[PDB]
């Protein structure tokens, strides 16, 4: 039933409140998702002024229900199966040699709109590190989200690494640990091990003077043949 909700283009709203080493901020996002093509188009605005962390560090936090699942893998799509009631998505994101983000989000439909409401808390960051020092490149993120079932919670877990390019030429690793649990009480699809191949392209609206990020993203399930 949940998959029926994703056969066309679905409006998306994202709302985030964050606090990182005491710097509080909010982000609002709007866009569209077309799961038939695994395609997301979004624009995010920092509504509190200047973002105190790099935009690239927030991409993964800021709707995997829009993944394209190949027909032969459709029985492994936890994310859509939880809809419309939704799921809670929690992460800890460990920035190597630096601080960590802990995030909790509720992803669900509000009418015809897919909504991602998030709280993020960041701690133990270095004032002169790659994050608070704004040393990360703004271009592209691409990696694989490794997914496994979590039968005890009627959900899933996932793990992955993001290699954020640093302006000096190096890498800032961000190790992601993820858990998703359904909000509703109904059956969900508990998947075999697989992954989501995800590519996010970051850009700017030349006419936008607010601190913002434009994102074109593709997400495709893979790893079962």
Q: What is the element string, with H for helices and E for strands?
A: EEEHEEEEEEEE
* CATH architecture designation: Beta Barrel
Total number of distinct structural domains: 1
| Alpha plus pi helix count | 1
Strands, count: 11
CATH superfamily: Green fluorescent protein
State the separation between the terminal residues, measured CA to CA.
Answer: 25 Å
The radius of gyration over CA amounts to: 17 Å
Largest sheet data:
11 strands, mixed, barrel
**What overall geometry do the principal axes of the alpha carbons give?**
globular
Beta content: over 45%
CATH uppermost class: Mainly Beta
What structural class do the secondary elements suggest?
A: mainly beta
State the share of residues found in helices, binned by percent.
under 10%
CATH fold type: Green Fluorescent Protein
Question: What's the layout of helices and strands?
Answer:
Elements lengths: L8 E12 L2 E12 L4 E8 L31 H4 L5 E9 L4 E11 L2 E11 L16 E11 L4 E11 L5 E12 L11 E10 L8 E11 L3
Parallel strand pairs: 1-6
Antiparallel strand pairs: 1-2, 2-3, 3-11, 4-5, 4-9, 5-6, 7-8, 7-10, 8-9, 10-11
PDB class: fluorescent protein
Keywords: fluorescent protein, fret donor
Assembly: monomeric
Concise synopsis of the structure shown:
The chain is mainly beta.
Tags for this model:
225 residues; mainly beta
Protein architecture, described:
This protein has 225 residues and is an all-beta fold. It has an eleven-stranded mixed β-barrel. It has one helix at 78-81; strands at residues 9-20, 23-34, 39-46, 87-95, 100-110, 113-123, 140-150, 155-165, 171-182, 194-203, 212-222. InterPro entries: GFP, GFP-related, Green_fluorescent_prot. Energy-transfer acceptor. Its role is to transduce the blue chemiluminescence of the protein aequorin into green fluorescent light by energy transfer. Fluoresces in vivo upon receiving energy from the Ca(2+)-activated photoprotein aequorin.
């Amino acid at each position: 039933k949940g998959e029926e909700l994703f056969t066309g283009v679905v409006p998306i709203l994202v709302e985030l409140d964050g606090d990182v080493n005491g710097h509080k901020f909010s982000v609002s996002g709007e866009g569209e998702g077309d799961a038939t093509y695994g395609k997301l188009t979004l624009k995010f605005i920092c509504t509190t002024g200047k973002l105190p962390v790099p935009w690239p560090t927030l991409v993964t936090t800021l709707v995997q229900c829009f993944a394209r699942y190949p027909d032969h893998m459709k029985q492994h799509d936890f994310f859509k199966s939880a809809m419309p009631e939704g799921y809670v998505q929690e992460r800890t994101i460990f920035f190597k040699d630096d601080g960590n983000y802990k995030t909790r989000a509720e992803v669900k439909f509000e009418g015809d709109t897919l909504v991602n409401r998030i709280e993020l808390k960041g701690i133990d960051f270095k004032e002169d590190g790659n994050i608070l020092g704004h040393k990360l490149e703004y271009n592209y993120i691409s990696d694989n989200v490794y997914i496994t079932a979590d039968k005890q919670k009627n959900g899933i877990k996932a793990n992955f690494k993001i290699r954020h390019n640093i302006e000096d030429g190096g890498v800032q690793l961000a190790d992601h640990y993820q858990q998703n649990t359904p909000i509703g009480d109904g059956p969900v699809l508990l998947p075999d091990n697989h992954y989501l191949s995800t590519q996010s392209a970051l850009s700017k609206d030349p006419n936008e003077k607010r601190d913002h990020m434009v994102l074109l993203e593709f997400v495709t399930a893979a790893g079962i043949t």
